[PDB]
Design a protein around this ligand. Structure first.
Ligand SMILES: [Mg+2]
Ligand SMILES: [Mg+2]
Ligand SMILES: [Mg+2]
Length: 92
RNA sequence: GGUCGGGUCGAGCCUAGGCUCCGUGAGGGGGGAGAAGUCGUAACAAGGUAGCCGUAGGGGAACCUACGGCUCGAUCACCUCCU
């Protein structure tokens, strides 16, 4: 339900790299090696192909970022119906 | 005191060669942490082919095989040597 606020933007998980590292495709047509904060790492399980919010790192904000929130099925369905995001971004 | 001649000592400077230090450096090599990637299961019980040492060959990877050695090897039957 919460939306990106600032430099944050959506993203689609592509492949997990191990040791809490994911490979997320963002809305600006860039692939980023993203790091999962440990606070939500322990309680929220993330799997390839999900809509998430990613904030790029302050330095070298082109290939690194942090994942802050995961969108459930109802939230992504509501977003698709509202029209803030399209279907081809999710499906690739 | 000037000028010239002779003998000797000499900091510095130039060239060549030989050693050595500092900065960058394409490319390559292992080491150490991390643990929400991956393929197997080598070790500990007889760990499911006992494990390990030396040498040599082979294999995605732990590993496998041959010759000589050690017990830091389990179970059953028989034998030997003691207290
Ligand atoms: Mg084994
Ligand atoms: Mg074995
Ligand atoms: Mg062979």
């Amino acid at each position: 339900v919460p939306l990106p606020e600032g430099n944050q933007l959506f993203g689609v998980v592509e492949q997990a790299l191990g040791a809490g590292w994911m490979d997320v495709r963002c809305e600006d047509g860039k692939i980023r090696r993203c790091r999962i904060p440990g606070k939500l790492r322990r309680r929220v399980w993330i799997r390839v192909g999900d809509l998430v919010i990613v904030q790029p790192w302050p330095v070298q904000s082109d290939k690194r970022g942090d994942i802050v929130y995961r969108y459930t099925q109802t939230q992504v369905d509501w977003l698709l119906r509202k029209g803030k995001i399209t279907q081809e971004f999710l499906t690739g």
